[PDB]
Design an enzyme around this catalytic site. Structure first.
Site, PDB file in Angstrom:
ATOM      1  N   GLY A 134       0.796  -1.213   0.000  1.00 27.45           N
ATOM      2  CA  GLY A 134       0.000   0.000   0.000  1.00 27.45           C
ATOM      3  C   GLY A 134       0.831   1.266   0.000  1.00 27.45           C
ATOM      4  O   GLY A 134       0.469   2.252  -0.643  1.00 27.45           O
ATOM      5  N   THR A 135       1.947   1.250   0.729  1.00 22.97           N
ATOM      6  CA  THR A 135       2.832   2.409   0.764  1.00 22.97           C
ATOM      7  C   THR A 135       3.494   2.622  -0.590  1.00 22.97           C
ATOM      8  O   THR A 135       3.411   3.706  -1.174  1.00 22.97           O
ATOM      9  CB  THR A 135       3.889   2.234   1.856  1.00 22.97           C
ATOM     10  OG1 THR A 135       4.678   1.072   1.577  1.00 22.97           O
ATOM     11  CG2 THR A 135       3.233   2.066   3.208  1.00 22.97           C
ATOM     12  N   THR A 169       2.139 -13.029  -1.700  1.00 24.31           N
ATOM     13  CA  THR A 169       2.010 -13.012  -0.251  1.00 24.31           C
ATOM     14  C   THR A 169       0.737 -12.343   0.226  1.00 24.31           C
ATOM     15  O   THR A 169       0.243 -12.683   1.299  1.00 24.31           O
ATOM     16  CB  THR A 169       3.204 -12.298   0.393  1.00 24.31           C
ATOM     17  OG1 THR A 169       3.276 -10.951  -0.091  1.00 24.31           O
ATOM     18  CG2 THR A 169       4.502 -13.022   0.072  1.00 24.31           C
ATOM     19  N   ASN A 218      17.782  -8.570  -2.958  1.00 23.00           N
ATOM     20  CA  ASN A 218      18.196  -7.172  -2.932  1.00 23.00           C
ATOM     21  C   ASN A 218      19.651  -7.007  -3.348  1.00 23.00           C
ATOM     22  O   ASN A 218      20.030  -5.957  -3.880  1.00 23.00           O
ATOM     23  CB  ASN A 218      17.964  -6.602  -1.538  1.00 23.00           C
ATOM     24  CG  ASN A 218      16.518  -6.677  -1.126  1.00 23.00           C
ATOM     25  OD1 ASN A 218      15.910  -7.739  -1.159  1.00 23.00           O
ATOM     26  ND2 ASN A 218      15.967  -5.557  -0.699  1.00 23.00           N
ATOM     27  N   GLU A 244      19.921   8.881 -22.117  1.00 22.45           N
ATOM     28  CA  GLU A 244      20.009   8.106 -23.346  1.00 22.45           C
ATOM     29  C   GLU A 244      18.872   7.096 -23.442  1.00 22.45           C
ATOM     30  O   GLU A 244      18.263   6.936 -24.505  1.00 22.45           O
ATOM     31  CB  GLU A 244      21.357   7.391 -23.411  1.00 22.45           C
ATOM     32  CG  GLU A 244      22.563   8.312 -23.475  1.00 22.45           C
ATOM     33  CD  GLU A 244      22.843   8.839 -24.861  1.00 22.45           C
ATOM     34  OE1 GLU A 244      22.363   8.231 -25.839  1.00 22.45           O
ATOM     35  OE2 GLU A 244      23.559   9.856 -24.971  1.00 22.45           O
TER      36      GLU A 244
HETATM   37  N1  LIG Z   1      12.241  -8.291  -4.515  1.00 19.66           N
HETATM   38  C1  LIG Z   1      11.895  -8.076  -3.252  1.00 19.66           C
HETATM   39  N2  LIG Z   1      10.568  -7.871  -2.939  1.00 19.66           N
HETATM   40  C2  LIG Z   1      10.201  -7.651  -1.656  1.00 19.66           C
HETATM   41  C3  LIG Z   1      11.140  -7.624  -0.644  1.00 19.66           C
HETATM   42  N3  LIG Z   1      10.497  -7.387   0.518  1.00 19.66           N
HETATM   43  C4  LIG Z   1       9.177  -7.257   0.262  1.00 19.66           C
HETATM   44  N4  LIG Z   1       8.981  -7.434  -1.081  1.00 19.66           N
HETATM   45  C5  LIG Z   1       7.718  -7.361  -1.827  1.00 19.66           C
HETATM   46  O1  LIG Z   1       6.875  -6.348  -1.320  1.00 19.66           O
HETATM   47  C6  LIG Z   1       5.534  -6.749  -1.478  1.00 19.66           C
HETATM   48  C7  LIG Z   1       4.628  -6.102  -0.435  1.00 19.66           C
HETATM   49  O2  LIG Z   1       5.048  -4.782  -0.175  1.00 19.66           O
HETATM   50  P1  LIG Z   1       6.055  -4.361   1.006  1.00 19.66           P
HETATM   51  O3  LIG Z   1       7.161  -3.486   0.480  1.00 19.66           O
HETATM   52  O4  LIG Z   1       6.577  -5.572   1.736  1.00 19.66           O
HETATM   53  O5  LIG Z   1       5.061  -3.529   1.946  1.00 19.66           O
HETATM   54  P2  LIG Z   1       4.688  -2.048   1.471  1.00 19.66           P
HETATM   55  O6  LIG Z   1       4.901  -1.900  -0.011  1.00 19.66           O
HETATM   56  O7  LIG Z   1       5.486  -1.014   2.222  1.00 19.66           O
HETATM   57  O8  LIG Z   1       3.139  -1.927   1.877  1.00 19.66           O
HETATM   58  P3  LIG Z   1       2.663  -2.092   3.400  1.00 19.66           P
HETATM   59  O9  LIG Z   1       2.775  -3.513   3.908  1.00 19.66           O
HETATM   60  O10 LIG Z   1       1.226  -1.649   3.472  1.00 19.66           O
HETATM   61  O11 LIG Z   1       3.532  -1.179   4.217  1.00 19.66           O
HETATM   62  C8  LIG Z   1       5.542  -8.262  -1.387  1.00 19.66           C
HETATM   63  O12 LIG Z   1       4.685  -8.798  -2.363  1.00 19.66           O
HETATM   64  C9  LIG Z   1       6.960  -8.666  -1.704  1.00 19.66           C
HETATM   65  O13 LIG Z   1       6.983  -9.345  -2.934  1.00 19.66           O
HETATM   66  C10 LIG Z   1      12.473  -7.831  -0.949  1.00 19.66           C
HETATM   67  O14 LIG Z   1      13.308  -7.810  -0.051  1.00 19.66           O
HETATM   68  N5  LIG Z   1      12.851  -8.056  -2.259  1.00 19.66           N
END
Ligand SMILES: Nc1nc2c(ncn2[C@@H]2O[C@H](COP(=O)(O)OP(=O)(O)OP(=O)(O)O)[C@@H](O)[C@H]2O)c(=O)[nH]1
Ligand SMILES: Nc1nc2c(ncn2[C@@H]2O[C@H](COP(=O)(O)OP(=O)(O)OP(=O)(O)O)[C@@H](O)[C@H]2O)c(=O)[nH]1
Ligand SMILES: Nc1nc2c(ncn2[C@@H]2O[C@H](COP(=O)(O)OP(=O)(O)O)[C@@H](O)[C@H]2O)c(=O)[nH]1
Ligand SMILES: Nc1nc2c(ncn2[C@@H]2O[C@H](COP(=O)(O)OP(=O)(O)O)[C@@H](O)[C@H]2O)c(=O)[nH]1
Ligand SMILES: [Mg+2]
Lengths: 427, 426, 32, 409, 426
Positions: A134-135, A169, A218, A244
């Site tokens: 969501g963020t 997830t 990451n 570019e």
């Molecule tokens: N490639 C990658 N994806 C990640 C990683 N951590 C979380 N995600 C992805 O992030 C998605 C969910 O968003 P998050 O960034 O974890 O949470 P958010 O975007 O801040 O949203 P909120 O939970 O509401 O705060 C999941 O479907 C994961 O696939 C990571 O370390 N590497």
């Protein structure tokens, strides 16, 4: 020349934790911030011998930010940069875009302004977000809206994480991806997709890691960014800038979605028994076993491709290698484009960080291409989003926040219109 | 910052909460005296969610005990970790309702609930950012059901924009402690479907079944049942207290598991839960946690989900784990048994990982599934309610206090359309 | 005794109404 | 060249107790201060804390003046009843302090107008100083009460009745609130629970930065007579907003890259003013920039150019050259136990605008409401006043409001 | 420097003053034998406000005991801190009034008031800069109320510029010891409105109620009630005795809380007050002190301030605290509860901070609210007074002593016009 990097969400700032780790270990800076001129693109110099990164971590939940405040790099980041909210959007696009977003994005803006003011020859911004949350989805699109009205002419490199087709997830992520793309379409200038199942398969097969966590994911993302900014940081035999890619890869102002890949992702043991040269890594950058988005360009047609080369690479063989690719017939380019490649070679090899699972390779290739296989992923998202929307499942949360039924239908038909757009350019 | 105020009602609520505060305080390294004696700095970072520092290491729990008979209050101060609660938070009546939902909701509630509200107000304004309230009670008794449900209704009209958990054990014919169980359960559920944000169904029958087969205990007193329930409550709110690779807060779980505002009754399970005879022969990997999680004989309700369909499900993992393994296990259990899942929602399972295990184990998990099979309890309870009310049994103890007959008919209609509406989405 | 109950009921109602009024006044100040 | 400092009241001499600590810690350059001071108050409790403190031997015993009993937040009491017996002893000392001096630049007075001693006998001291010397400058750094943060009740009565004499007696008057300083310590210094001591420490920083031009040799020096011309375009408009940069902690300072361009900006945002008022509502009449330490004239010159070309803030239509710069070489010193980190360079800005016209208007209603019902008036009248001076001080501030509105057009 | 002469009258005044000199002598570190034995330097330089150095380090209090019965004098001389007074200061009649205001104001006072005035004069000019006098008496008794009131009038005739504090208890019908309480209290107030400078109203209902609810004492004898009243009196004159970050003397508080000359009846409260069993379950912060301060169930009068509005209020803080927190807390309570405060007065709260806490505590506070809810008691008294005086009950016990009917009518008139002016300003 300078470029600043902003990180939104849990996945965003975790990716940054690997990037700035890689950066200081590359430019020989300890985590405290002092050397024992090419660092000027990313680090500004205090003048007292301390180097501070050009970045702002921001999210809505204070958990992931405050382990960073107390890790090894407590002293590298300026405190104001690490923005943090008080409560999470909770996998709710509307909650991040209208309820809680409206209070936090204005603080991020009046911060990012003085990062740009400290800069002189700003090349652009580059944003990190995962659309499943969501963020990263909600205030990410809101931040991109306000960034477009502020600067406009400056590049905004969007390295986004799309939800995987099967491995997921969250459960409301189809809603979040469709509504977010509706604005990511007309704001981001160059948007690169990074799936999660593809990176999972790379670490399983190539790195032969059978139990990967988010750390390794990451790590290799930072490797691609490092390979992409080496042309800006260091001098090579044939360099490109970030402006570019704006021209050379996106034929129409709405087709900006690139498939990324990198080679060679090789463990510590294969390198000892295997040979590195330019021709084989030029090959390995194109096979779908090394792509970062679950799609198959074999089903699509290429518009234009881009090729980053790092290390001991001469220009004669990059030309000969790309020639061999064009004469092959497994992949074909669009009729309108006779020439479909943008090549680039830089002198500095990729450095290694201790604790990572990337070997010290003599040479590497980072490929960034554009195709029509990307149209299949967007269509694949529409089937399961429309699947649930008709019965109005989970709609009550978003509409209770202050939205209505109108924006679902109008965002739905906009991305549906994009489907027809991709099909007509391919013909 | 994100904060949970805890409320315990009735005798059932007091024992459940008592063993709960021992488990959390032991996780944060606070001794029975209430002073900090832990070692890791990580344990101090997130004590604002459940405690307040008083002076000189003294941490007081953010809880409110509420009942009607002093036997429970004295039994709480006697046991260990009994000296940590603030004595002013023992808001407390004197007469006693005694398994009469009308006495718990109309007569004695009308003079005790202003007091318990005032304590809750101080506890809510004492902190900064409310995440929600946490209420533990039963549905068979009177001082827990009627009073606690009135407290829920009063609080929801005060702070409408905050979450609220309620953990409620419900009666069943095989464990029938009182005689008017259906007359209490049906009226209580009528108020819960219109007030609470989400409920977590429990029962004593399944807990006895868990203690027989899985724990293989000889003498399962109430201490062990409260131990299982406490482990579940600690497991769900572990994400707010410790960092992890994928954090999932209470609101994040609520919006991910509730597709429609009336479908908020969950069945819960916890793993690993093994006997001491077989805990030595076991392994600790992700597949062994899942296939013990998703087992039907591990649910903490007597509502077998394979007699229905899963809408959504959730797993909260604790311990240093690989997120790839977490996601592929949820994928496997959803692809094989595809019939048990709802069809118009793909990827029915929300998953999260936290990097702090509970003490005594290396890796654990917590399952929250929102199935449609929960309607077995609603039909199972409503027929006993009907069997007495067609003939006006025990009615005058309810009627002579202020309730009339249309209250029972309205309660019957709402419970009956609820099980009907679960059946339609099924 | 009846009038005494009337006194202790009217004051409580008066008290609740005064508390609501304060809330409204506070909201106006924040919103302005 | 020397300048002597007078301190009145509970607030005055506590500000001085921090200010003189900085002067001794900072130090022929000393000649302008070494002390040439006088503490005076009606309550002996705070003065006799100095008499037994660490600086027992530093101050000559007579210097520390102290009355017998307090004015008790009563302007009339501290101006008519009790002032009349102590003010003569004070100024008949300050005279021989001036006779000790030869090249007196001026006097500088520290007082808070909310109280009775700071307000009442402040004005009384000022009136006999103006008739005795006239020409010599008297810089008054006063502390006005905040709009919403407040400690007393009758302070509107005191603030209006004090201002009526602060107009035509002091030469250069710097406003300072407590809420604005509280906000500064909360925002920049990130001190969430500040006390009076921290406020007084950074007030001393401002005072030191405007007298360092006399004490130490800079690239462009500026005396007290210079502020007299360059910032007051009219004989009755001398009320100055203050600001300082960089107000910054010990850790943040090293992380950030302090320079001349950004601190010239930071000294202009309303997030860093020492007085709770928004200069976005007003138009700058003149600005004055004291630069200390590592400053070349080029970047200060470049910085005033960027301010003029911005449109977030505006100037009066009268001044194209609306600035007065000043550069001194010695960097600002630090106090052990202080919160400000060592900086190569700092900026103290003193401006003049029409935003100050808002604070008086805001003040008027609070005084007006109480006066209409004759609240607390019986205390002041029995002390020796009448209804005449209440109403006439009221109409004096009414004239000042029209004055600012006329000049601002 | 500034000087406080102490005058105690009647049984209530003597026993309240006995506990008062116990706690002040301990604060200044003086032994029961009269010699200095303290530790800190701070306790020496400001003992002239309450003591006189006699010879050989003999510090005798500057107090005057005054009554008409020897039981109180002998009980005073018997107990500890009883051998520290000068025996010449025990000015003492012999006959006794006995709850007859006329005896204590016209007949028996006529032969004692000469001797008290001799002692108080010699004791007044012994010191240089008088700050004021401090009287502790009652309004129900005869020798306390009547003689003490007459002494107040004579003192204000001689010293018209000096300050005057009166800690007076008033009778209430719920705790009614004597039968002629209204006849005494009404006449006593008639003289207090024109003679005293400010009167801090007390009562036994609130004191007994405070020890029941907040202190949770089992047997609250007069010792504990007198201990609480003494703690208030020490708090009100801590500014003179100790240096602070913001000082507020007697005159400073008087001008900030009295907006009109006849509006000088205050309500008092002391914080913190906590049970012995819960003393370690709490923090010690400014917000905690403020919540206990502004509680209406914490005034030491039986007059609920939420039944009216505050005109002004005062808070004297003691301890190392941040002034910002003081002003923010006062502003917060001034905005949220906007209806309970007067509108044509902004800033109804004066605050002050002293740097020396009372012995044994870390941070304390004293509240003095000048509210318009105090008029209920005057009506609560006048209705009783009229009930007797409509029918000349007990009237001859006063009439045959000198009072005529015009005196009682005048007392009703002053009481009635006063309650109208409080009602006017609400
Ligand atoms: N490639 C990658 N994806 C990640 C990683 N951590 C979380 N995600 C992805 O992030 C998605 C969910 O968003 P998050 O960034 O974890 O949470 P958010 O975007 O801040 O949203 P909120 O939970 O509401 O705060 C999941 O479907 C994961 O696939 C990571 O370390 N590497
Ligand atoms: N900045 C600052 N202001 C103070 C300090 N002490 C008091 N004040 C201000 O002074 C005002 C009241 O006047 P005081 O100085 O305390 O007392 P006074 O001026 O001597 O007058 P009297 O009380 O009659 O003696 C309050 O509004 C405070 O804001 C201080 O240490 N620092
Ligand atoms: N799990 C558990 N359940 C309990 C415990 N004590 C009582 N109960 C349950 O409470 C139900 C009866 O409710 P009761 O205690 O009388 O509720 P109350 O009178 O409203 O407080 C029974 O069905 C029990 O199963 C306990 O210690 N643990
Ligand atoms: N707080 C307190 N009140 C007292 C004490 N002694 C008497 N009183 C009150 O004083 C009133 C009677 O006053 P009294 O002693 O007869 O006064 P006197 O006869 O003039 O000395 C009663 O209402 C008591 O409540 C005491 O030691 N402490
Ligand atoms: Mg003062």
């Amino acid at each position: 020349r300078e470029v600043i990097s902003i990180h939104i969400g849990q996945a965003g700032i975790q990716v940054g934790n690997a990037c700035w780790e890689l950066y200081c270990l590359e430019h020989g800076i300890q985590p405290d911030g002092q050397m024992p001129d090419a660092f000027n693109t990313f680090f500004s110099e205090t003048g007292a011998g301390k180097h501070v990164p050009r970045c702002i971590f921001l999210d809505l939940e204070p958990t992931v930010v405050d382990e960073v405040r107390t890790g090894t790099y407590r002293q590298l980041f300026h405190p104001e940069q690490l923005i943090s909210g008080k409560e999470d959007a909770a996998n709710n696009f509307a909650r991040g875009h209208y309820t809680i977003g409206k209070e936090i994005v204005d603080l991020a803006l009046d911060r990012i302004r003085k990062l740009a003011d400290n800069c002189t020859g700003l090349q652009g911004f580059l944003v990190f977000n995962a659309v499943g949350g969501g963020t990263g989805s909600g205030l990410g699109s809101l931040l991109l809206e306000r960034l477009s009205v502020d600067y406009g002419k400056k590049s905004k490199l969007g390295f986004t994480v799309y939800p995987s087709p099967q491995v997921s997830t969250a459960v409301v992520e189809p809603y979040n991806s469709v509504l977010s793309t509706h604005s990511l379409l007309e704001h981001t200038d160059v948007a690169v997709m990074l799936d999660n199942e593809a990176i999972y398969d790379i670490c399983r097969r190539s790195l032969d890691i059978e139990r990967p966590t988010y750390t390794n994911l990451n790590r290799l993302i930072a490797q691609v960014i490092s390979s992409l900014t080496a042309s800006l940081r260091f001098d090579g035999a044939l360099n490109v800038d970030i402006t570019e890619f704006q021209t050379n890869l996106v034929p129409y102002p709405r087709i900006h979605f690139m498939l990324s890949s990198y080679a060679p992702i090789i463990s510590a043991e294969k390198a000892y028994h295997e040979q590195l040269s330019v021709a084989e890594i030029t090959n390995a950058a194109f096979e779908p076993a090394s792509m970062m988005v679950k799609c198959d360009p074999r089903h699509g047609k290429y518009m234009a491709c881009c090729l980053m080369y790092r290390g001991d690479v001469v220009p004669k063989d990059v030309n000969a290698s790309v020639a061999t690719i064009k004469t092959k017939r497994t992949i074909q380019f669009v009729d309108w484009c006779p020439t479909g490649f943008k090549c680039g070679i830089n002198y500095q090899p990729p450095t290694v960080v201790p604790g990572g699972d990337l070997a010290k390779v003599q040479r590497a290739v980072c490929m960034i291409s554009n195709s029509t296989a990307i149209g299949e992923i967007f269509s694949r998202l529409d089937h399961k989003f429309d699947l649930m929307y008709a019965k109005r499942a989970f709609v009550h949360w978003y509409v209770g926040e202050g939205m209505e039924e109108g924006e679902f239908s109008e965002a739905r038909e906009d991305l549906a219109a994009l489907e027809k757009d991709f099909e007509e350019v391919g013909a | 910052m994100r904060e949970i105020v805890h409320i315990q009602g009735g005798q059932c609520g007091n024992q459940i909460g008592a063993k709960f505060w021992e488990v959390v305080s032991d996780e944060h390294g606070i001794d029975p005296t209430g002073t900090y004696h832990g070692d890791s700095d990580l344990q101090l970072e997130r004590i604002n969610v459940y405690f307040n520092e008083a002076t000189g290491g003294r941490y007081v729990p953010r809880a409110i005990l509420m009942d009607l008979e002093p036997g429970t209050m004295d039994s709480v101060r006697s046991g260990p970790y009994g000296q940590i609660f603030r004595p002013d938070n023992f808001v407390f009546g004197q007469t006693g309702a005694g398994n009469n939902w009308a006495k718990g909701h109309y007569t004695e509630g009308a003079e005790l609930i202003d007091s318990v509200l005032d304590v809750v107000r101080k506890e809510a304004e004492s902190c900064d950012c409310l995440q929600g309230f946490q209420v533990c009670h039963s549905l068979g008794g009177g001082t827990g059901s009627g009073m606690g449900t009135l407290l829920i209704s009063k609080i929801r009209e005060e702070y409408p924009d905050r979450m609220m958990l309620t953990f409620s054990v419900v009666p069943s014919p095989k464990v029938s402690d009182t005689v008017v169980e259906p007359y209490n359960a049906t009226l209580s559920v009528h108020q819960l479907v219109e007030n609470a944000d989400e409920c977590m169904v429990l029962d004593n029958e399944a807990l006895y079944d868990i203690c027989f087969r899985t724990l293989k205990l000889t003498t399962p007193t109430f201490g062990d049942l409260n131990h299982l329930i406490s482990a579940v409550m600690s497991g769900i709110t572990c994400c707010l207290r410790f960092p992890g690779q994928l954090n999932a807060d209470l609101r994040k779980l609520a919006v991910n598991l509730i597709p429609f505002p009336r479908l908020h009754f969950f069945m819960v399970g916890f793993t690993p839960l093994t006997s001491r005879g077989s805990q030595q022969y076991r392994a600790l990997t992700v597949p062994e946690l899942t296939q013990q999680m998703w087992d039907a004989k591990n649910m903490m309700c007597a509502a077998d989900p394979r007699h229905g369909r899963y809408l959504t499900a959730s797993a909260l993992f604790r311990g240093r784990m690989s997120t790839k393994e977490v996601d592929e296990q949820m994928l496997n259990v959803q692809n094989k048994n595809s019939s048990y899942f709802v069809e118009w929602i793909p990827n029915n399972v929300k998953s999260s990982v936290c990097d702090i295990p509970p003490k005594g184990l290396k890796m654990s998990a917590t399952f929250i599934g929102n199935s449609t099979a929960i309607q077995e309890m609603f039909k199972r309870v409503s027929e006993q309610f009907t069997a007495m009310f067609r003939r006006k049994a025990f009615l005058h103890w309810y009627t002579g206090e202020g309730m009339d007959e249309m209250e029972f008919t309205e309660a019957e209609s709402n419970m009956n359309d609820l099980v009907s509406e679960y059946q339609q989405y099924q | 005794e009846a009038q005494q109950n009337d006194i202790k009921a009217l004051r409580r109602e008066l008290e609740l109404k005064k508390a609501k009024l304060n809330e409204l006044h506070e909201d106006v100040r924040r919103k302005e």
